[PDB]
Design an enzyme around this catalytic site. Structure first.
Site, short mmCIF file in Angstrom:
data_model
loop_
_atom_site.label_atom_id
_atom_site.label_comp_id
_atom_site.label_asym_id
_atom_site.label_seq_id
_atom_site.Cartn_x
_atom_site.Cartn_y
_atom_site.Cartn_z
CB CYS B 41 -0.89 -0.01 1.24
SG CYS B 41 -1.75 1.57 1.54
CB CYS B 46 -2.88 2.27 -2.18
SG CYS B 46 -3.33 0.51 -1.87
CE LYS B 49 -4.13 4.08 -7.27
NZ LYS B 49 -4.49 2.66 -7.38
CE1 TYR B 180 -9.64 -2.51 -8.68
CE2 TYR B 180 -9.88 -4.71 -9.63
CZ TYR B 180 -10.32 -3.70 -8.78
OH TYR B 180 -11.45 -3.93 -8.03
CD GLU B 184 -5.66 1.93 -10.56
OE1 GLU B 184 -4.50 1.84 -10.06
OE2 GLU B 184 -6.73 1.90 -9.90
CG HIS B 450 -29.46 20.82 -9.04
ND1 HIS B 450 -29.31 19.98 -10.11
CD2 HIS B 450 -29.80 22.03 -9.56
CE1 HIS B 450 -29.48 20.66 -11.24
NE2 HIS B 450 -29.77 21.91 -10.93
CD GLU B 455 -28.75 16.67 -9.31
OE1 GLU B 455 -29.91 16.81 -8.88
OE2 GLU B 455 -28.10 17.63 -9.78
C1 LIG Z 1 0.20 -1.07 -8.22
C2 LIG Z 1 -0.78 -1.45 -7.13
C3 LIG Z 1 -1.75 -0.47 -6.82
C4 LIG Z 1 -2.77 -0.76 -5.94
N1 LIG Z 1 -3.73 0.23 -5.65
C5 LIG Z 1 -4.68 -0.02 -4.71
C6 LIG Z 1 -5.69 0.94 -4.43
O1 LIG Z 1 -5.66 2.06 -4.99
N2 LIG Z 1 -6.63 0.66 -3.47
C7 LIG Z 1 -6.65 -0.59 -2.84
O2 LIG Z 1 -7.52 -0.84 -2.02
N3 LIG Z 1 -5.69 -1.53 -3.14
C8 LIG Z 1 -4.73 -1.27 -4.07
N4 LIG Z 1 -3.78 -2.23 -4.33
C9 LIG Z 1 -3.86 -3.56 -3.59
C10 LIG Z 1 -3.29 -3.38 -2.16
O3 LIG Z 1 -2.07 -2.69 -2.18
C11 LIG Z 1 -3.05 -4.76 -1.51
O4 LIG Z 1 -4.28 -5.45 -1.56
C12 LIG Z 1 -2.67 -4.60 -0.04
O5 LIG Z 1 -1.46 -3.83 0.00
C13 LIG Z 1 -2.31 -5.97 0.55
O6 LIG Z 1 -2.00 -5.80 1.96
P1 LIG Z 1 -1.34 -7.16 2.63
O7 LIG Z 1 -1.27 -6.77 4.08
O8 LIG Z 1 -2.07 -8.38 2.25
O9 LIG Z 1 0.10 -7.27 1.94
P2 LIG Z 1 1.32 -6.28 1.84
O10 LIG Z 1 0.93 -4.82 2.05
O11 LIG Z 1 1.92 -6.62 0.53
O12 LIG Z 1 2.23 -6.68 3.09
C14 LIG Z 1 2.98 -7.87 3.07
C15 LIG Z 1 4.28 -7.52 3.85
O13 LIG Z 1 4.87 -8.78 4.26
C16 LIG Z 1 6.27 -8.67 4.09
N5 LIG Z 1 6.78 -10.05 4.03
C17 LIG Z 1 6.56 -10.99 3.07
N6 LIG Z 1 7.16 -12.17 3.41
C18 LIG Z 1 7.77 -11.96 4.61
C19 LIG Z 1 8.53 -12.84 5.40
N7 LIG Z 1 8.46 -14.16 5.20
N8 LIG Z 1 8.99 -12.33 6.57
C20 LIG Z 1 8.78 -11.02 6.98
N9 LIG Z 1 8.02 -10.15 6.18
C21 LIG Z 1 7.53 -10.64 5.01
C22 LIG Z 1 6.43 -7.86 2.81
O14 LIG Z 1 7.69 -7.21 2.80
C23 LIG Z 1 5.31 -6.82 2.96
O15 LIG Z 1 5.79 -5.63 3.59
C24 LIG Z 1 -2.77 -1.96 -5.24
C25 LIG Z 1 -1.77 -2.95 -5.50
C26 LIG Z 1 -0.76 -2.67 -6.45
C27 LIG Z 1 0.40 -3.65 -6.57
C1 LIG Z 2 -27.37 32.60 -6.86
C2 LIG Z 2 -28.24 31.40 -6.50
C3 LIG Z 2 -27.59 30.16 -6.55
C4 LIG Z 2 -28.24 29.01 -6.10
N1 LIG Z 2 -27.58 27.78 -6.17
C5 LIG Z 2 -28.25 26.65 -5.82
C6 LIG Z 2 -27.59 25.38 -5.83
O1 LIG Z 2 -26.41 25.30 -6.22
N2 LIG Z 2 -28.30 24.26 -5.48
C7 LIG Z 2 -29.63 24.36 -5.05
O2 LIG Z 2 -30.23 23.35 -4.70
N3 LIG Z 2 -30.25 25.59 -5.02
C8 LIG Z 2 -29.58 26.72 -5.37
N4 LIG Z 2 -30.24 27.92 -5.34
C9 LIG Z 2 -31.70 27.96 -4.87
C10 LIG Z 2 -32.61 27.48 -6.03
O3 LIG Z 2 -32.27 28.11 -7.24
C11 LIG Z 2 -34.08 27.81 -5.71
O4 LIG Z 2 -34.37 27.21 -4.46
C12 LIG Z 2 -35.01 27.19 -6.74
O5 LIG Z 2 -34.66 27.74 -8.01
C13 LIG Z 2 -36.46 27.63 -6.47
O6 LIG Z 2 -37.33 26.98 -7.44
P1 LIG Z 2 -38.86 27.60 -7.42
O7 LIG Z 2 -39.56 26.67 -8.37
O8 LIG Z 2 -39.38 27.75 -6.05
O9 LIG Z 2 -38.69 29.08 -8.00
P2 LIG Z 2 -38.08 29.64 -9.35
O10 LIG Z 2 -37.11 28.68 -10.01
O11 LIG Z 2 -37.54 30.95 -8.94
O12 LIG Z 2 -39.35 29.73 -10.31
C14 LIG Z 2 -40.31 30.75 -10.13
C15 LIG Z 2 -40.78 31.11 -11.57
O13 LIG Z 2 -42.06 31.79 -11.43
C16 LIG Z 2 -42.07 32.85 -12.36
N5 LIG Z 2 -43.11 33.79 -11.88
C17 LIG Z 2 -43.11 34.54 -10.75
N6 LIG Z 2 -44.28 35.23 -10.64
C18 LIG Z 2 -45.02 34.91 -11.72
C19 LIG Z 2 -46.30 35.34 -12.11
N7 LIG Z 2 -47.11 35.91 -11.21
N8 LIG Z 2 -46.79 34.81 -13.26
C20 LIG Z 2 -46.09 33.92 -14.05
N9 LIG Z 2 -44.81 33.50 -13.67
C21 LIG Z 2 -44.30 34.00 -12.52
C22 LIG Z 2 -40.65 33.39 -12.33
O14 LIG Z 2 -40.36 34.06 -13.54
C23 LIG Z 2 -39.83 32.10 -12.25
O15 LIG Z 2 -39.45 31.63 -13.54
C24 LIG Z 2 -29.59 29.08 -5.75
C25 LIG Z 2 -30.27 30.33 -5.73
C26 LIG Z 2 -29.59 31.49 -6.13
C27 LIG Z 2 -30.39 32.79 -6.29
#
Ligand SMILES: Cc1cc2nc3c(=O)[nH]c(=O)nc-3n(C[C@H](O)[C@H](O)[C@H](O)COP(=O)(O)OP(=O)(O)OC[C@H]3O[C@@H](n4cnc5c(N)ncnc54)[C@H](O)[C@@H]3O)c2cc1C
Ligand SMILES: Cc1cc2nc3c(=O)[nH]c(=O)nc-3n(C[C@H](O)[C@H](O)[C@H](O)COP(=O)(O)OP(=O)(O)OC[C@H]3O[C@@H](n4cnc5c(N)ncnc54)[C@H](O)[C@@H]3O)c2cc1C
Ligand SMILES: NC(=O)C1=CN([C@@H]2O[C@H](COP(=O)(O)OP(=O)(O)OC[C@H]3O[C@@H](n4cnc5c(N)ncnc54)[C@H](OP(=O)(O)O)[C@@H]3O)[C@@H](O)[C@H]2O)C=CC1
Ligand SMILES: NC(=O)C1=CN([C@@H]2O[C@H](COP(=O)(O)OP(=O)(O)OC[C@H]3O[C@@H](n4cnc5c(N)ncnc54)[C@H](OP(=O)(O)O)[C@@H]3O)[C@@H](O)[C@H]2O)C=CC1
Lengths: 461, 461
Positions: B41, B46, B49, B180, B184, B450, B455
């Site tokens: 690891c 891990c 990498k 894998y 990668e 959103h 979502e």
């Molecule tokens: C390129 C690569 C990338 C990977 N990326 C990921 C990832 O992103 N996410 C993930 O979940 N897994 C990943 N894995 C898998 C993960 O690394 C292994 O599943 C995990 O390390 C295994 O843990 P282990 O304890 O079984 O063995 P190891 O971590 O290999 O430990 C075994 C240890 O025993 C020692 N040893 C061996 N024989 C003896 C001996 N007789 N006496 C004393 N010491 C000894 C070795 O030196 C070693 O240090 C990756 C593996 C590889 C090779």
């Molecule tokens: C800058 C900003 C960023 C935001 N970012 C996020 C976010 O990232 N994630 C999130 O979940 N929420 C976010 N929000 C909140 C989200 O946009 C509002 O909660 C959501 O748009 C409200 O939906 P609504 O249907 O209640 O109203 P609106 O979408 O405002 O719809 C009301 C509609 O009714 C119309 N209307 C009004 N009066 C009349 C009338 N009498 N006759 C006919 N039409 C009319 C208006 O023109 C409008 O089109 C953000 C809000 C702002 C202002």
């Protein structure tokens, strides 16, 4: 008067999703839309924001290029290039959305809807009347801005709508507010090269999030070069010879307040919340209830106080997210046209991602909400903080922080909170597990995937 | 003879995880290691990498830089830069691993262990004897290479071990195998600028994966500029004046076989599987059972045929992944030293990611395995293919493909398979849900996040 089975006012995320599912169930449906189909999500929200976020992410990887064995890049960003492509993609989606409606056989009624004073609920659009036994209000919201009476010169600032009309990168940006839009926009502008300040009323951003997130996100903004102006508020804005001058008051607790002017500001962005779009609907003509901010009041089934009238999405002022509007809209369609009387959206455990740098993912209860609900002897949290191995070879660092909030003897997982590289795509599957009622044993007995950041969530101790 | 409570042969992922948990439970434990702590690891697997994968990913983003509004980069990669930093990071981890053992009070015995012919199981290292009532064999594997008798010149090729010793980028690379490591490594070499061919015995890579993955991955390699040589095998390798010349036979079914020589090859990489490291253990002295490949045979509790001797990890030849070795090692420690007689690893639903470009994530049954297990009238699959919105503004495209395999009337989710940007960090939480026995309703009733790729898994229809 033209009668439909279902009339949906507003063609944004919630209205379109509801109309489409109703039509699949056989309803004769019509959508009224005054501007562009797709609403906020497509036009001035989620989608164009994500394009700009991907752009800001490229900028960050440009910074690490030499660290990874490549020659460094000078990298003067051209805002106009990505703006044109972003607008074109929006146009493509507008066309796709229209086609989706046509194929579903939904009528599109173009214009601004208002209710009339007729006995049974009826709307008027451009002098023509439409009725249905079921009428959905899904009119969304709009950015909130200060009144000129309270802040003189406030109208010189822009909102998130105005951000998407910008045709060049502002040299100097001041963003006001401490929520989603303020954090995302400050991250975008700063990464693309604007000298950016974020002005916030308290000491941290995202104060309704778990404290670990609010603290970490505020630190990450600073580390990325955003100037965070704490305990500060705008008093006045003036147009000068060379841009705006912003007068601010900083009032740190335990100190005397101090006034500062920020000169030569190119862009002032108000990101202080949203207000519902209900003023021009003539709700009063039917006595539909609203709160003091104008949100339509609904019950757990999206019913208003008037029979046969419903509301979903941002207009109701609860969990203002695109997928919540869609899910509530779809569940409502099944209740009405498939007669599933128990079909409703559960507003608990809604996941959300903030597209900061690095992004934040959260679902469920914060540590404080859990302590309030279950009691302090009943809540256990597990957390970790590490530097993702992406940064093992780089001079620039970001952190990954993760917290799991568990409740009761079984350690039911009631909240997950994280910020870090990749957390935008990591969250969805954990949200399914949370929704199913996973315990910490369920996480621990899932085999990890290595080497990833996501595996840290299943190996917490 | 020095007695311990637990003696672990091999200090890689499985041996270290087992020894550490046993020591926490009070066992007096010792680890024998002949080379470097951390095993495959850390040293040749891990971790190094993943560093190279992150490097290859930078190269891809370099390609999209101009599309995203920045000036394009020339980008001659310097292999030596990242190699030095990769080796340094490995060294850091070696030191951390050693410290972790010392802090746990585990003795490290340096040298090569072999069993002796003594009545009760006893090992010898450098002429000194050690015994314990519980002895874990966790000696891992090593790369498989062809015999010179079968392929003349095979020893001129390298394996994945040799890949990590390379000090410069090979100009021309031929990789042989279809699993894998082949996928990668071909992705890494090709992205960093080597002219790369992948030589495979059939028509697709990763043939034990779901067919949708095997097909898509083979297409994505081709689209990324890897030459995939189908139905082809190496016959001989010769050292010429300017590198290796590789003779191959291509035998497409329904055609006549044809021989081709590939000239001027700088690197020939054998990636054709692994073999267990058991030859030099003197297993025969105790009659420990092995299969014909040398894998130690174990039962579901990791017991060998001899009482008090166990094996975990790659040496057993099942699910050769770092976290499986760790989980099996830990479960074994709880069984032995916490007396949890039912403590064992479930080998079903192990998730895995292949770090291709884009990466692949899979957990559970392929469509064919599900059809075999449940019957064809009982399996339903849902799938989607789309271009991630990252590529909305780019000339280069990759695809995202996702498949969900469901079984029975409830549509229990028995397999998930995907390839696409972000799928490396997306999978872990879905694997928790799968492990908990999620149905398609559980996915569908989780609110989406959103705008993300993830979502799409909760909105399949
Ligand atoms: C390129 C690569 C990338 C990977 N990326 C990921 C990832 O992103 N996410 C993930 O979940 N897994 C990943 N894995 C898998 C993960 O690394 C292994 O599943 C995990 O390390 C295994 O843990 P282990 O304890 O079984 O063995 P190891 O971590 O290999 O430990 C075994 C240890 O025993 C020692 N040893 C061996 N024989 C003896 C001996 N007789 N006496 C004393 N010491 C000894 C070795 O030196 C070693 O240090 C990756 C593996 C590889 C090779
Ligand atoms: C800058 C900003 C960023 C935001 N970012 C996020 C976010 O990232 N994630 C999130 O979940 N929420 C976010 N929000 C909140 C989200 O946009 C509002 O909660 C959501 O748009 C409200 O939906 P609504 O249907 O209640 O109203 P609106 O979408 O405002 O719809 C009301 C509609 O009714 C119309 N209307 C009004 N009066 C009349 C009338 N009498 N006759 C006919 N039409 C009319 C208006 O023109 C409008 O089109 C953000 C809000 C702002 C202002
Ligand atoms: N990624 C995503 O899903 C996104 C979702 N959205 C949705 O849109 C909603 C609205 O976004 P946003 O506009 O950021 O609003 P938010 O409500 O999320 O945050 C605004 C914050 O600004 C601060 N504020 C309020 N009034 C003032 C004021 N008068 N002067 C200075 N600061 C003030 C407050 O924080 P404090 O009390 O600490 O001062 C307030 O919490 C979000 O809540 C979210 O639901 C929006 C963008 C992205
Ligand atoms: N990301 C991760 O988790 C990683 C995990 N690992 C672990 O290490 C293991 C071993 O990796 P790898 O070496 O790729 O082995 P694999 O067993 O995964 O694949 C080798 C493949 O090469 C082909 N092959 C076998 N013999 C020959 C031959 N004589 N000539 C040409 N082709 C041959 C076979 O496929 P075919 O029949 O189609 O010809 C075989 O399936 C993996 O299976 C995995 O468990 C390794 C790397 C990364």
């Amino acid at each position: 008067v033209a009668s439909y089975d279902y009339l949906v006012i507003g063609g944004g995320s919630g209205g379109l999703a509801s109309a489409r599912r109703a039509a699949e169930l056989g309803a004769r449906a019509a959508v009224v839309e005054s501007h562009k189909l797709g609403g906020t999500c497509v036009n001035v929200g989620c989608v164009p924001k994500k394009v700009m976020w991907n752009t800001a992410v490229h900028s960050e990887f440009m910074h690490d290029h030499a660290d990874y064995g490549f020659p460094s890049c000078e990298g003067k960003f051209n805002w106009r290039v990505i703006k044109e492509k972003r607008d074109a993609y929006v146009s493509r989606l507008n066309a796709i959305y229209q086609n989706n409606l046509t194929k579903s056989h939904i009528e599109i009624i173009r214009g601004h809807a208002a209710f009339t004073s007729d006995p049974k609920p009826t709307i008027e659009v451009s002098g023509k009347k439409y009725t249905a036994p079921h009428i959905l209000i899904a009119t969304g919201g709009m950015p909130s801005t200060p009144h000129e009476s309270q802040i003189p010169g406030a109208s010189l600032g822009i909102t998130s709508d105005g951000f998407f009309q910008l045709e060049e990168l502002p040299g100097r940006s001041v963003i006001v507010g401490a929520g989603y839009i303020a954090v995302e926009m400050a991250g975008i502008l700063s990464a693309l090269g604007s000298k950016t300040s974020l002005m916030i009323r308290h000491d941290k951003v995202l104060r309704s999030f778990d404290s670990m997130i609010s603290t970490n996100c505020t630190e990450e903004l600073e580390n990325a070069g955003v100037e965070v102006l704490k305990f500060s508020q705008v008093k006045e804005v003036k147009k000068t010879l060379s841009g705006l001058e912003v007068s601010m008051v900083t009032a740190v607790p335990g100190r005397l307040p101090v006034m500062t002017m920020i000169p030569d500001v190119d862009c002032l962005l108000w990101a202080i919340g949203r207000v519902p779009n209900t003023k021009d609907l003539s709700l009063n003509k039917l006595g539909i209830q609203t709160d003091d901010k104008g949100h339509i009041i609904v019950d757990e089934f999206q019913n208003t106080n008037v029979k046969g009238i419903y509301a979903v999405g941002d207009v109701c002022g609860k969990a203002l997210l695109t997928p919540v509007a869609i899910a509530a809209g779809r569940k409502l369609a099944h209740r009405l046209f498939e007669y599933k009387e128990d079909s409703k959206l559960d507003y608990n455990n809604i996941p959300t991602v903030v597209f900061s740098h690095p992004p934040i993912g959260t679902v469920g209860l914060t540590e404080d909400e859990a302590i309030h609900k279950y009691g302090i002897e009943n809540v256990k949290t597990y957390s970790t903080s590490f530097t993702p191995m992406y940064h093992a070879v780089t001079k620039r660092k970001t952190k990954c922080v993760m917290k799991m909030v568990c409740a009761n003897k079984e350690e039911k997982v009631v909240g997950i909170h994280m910020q870090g590289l990749g957390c935008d795509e990591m969250l969805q599957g954990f949200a399914v597990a949370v929704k199913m009622g996973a315990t910490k044993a369920d996480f621990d007995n899932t085999v990890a995937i290595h080497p990833t950041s996501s595996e840290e969530l299943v190996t917490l101790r």
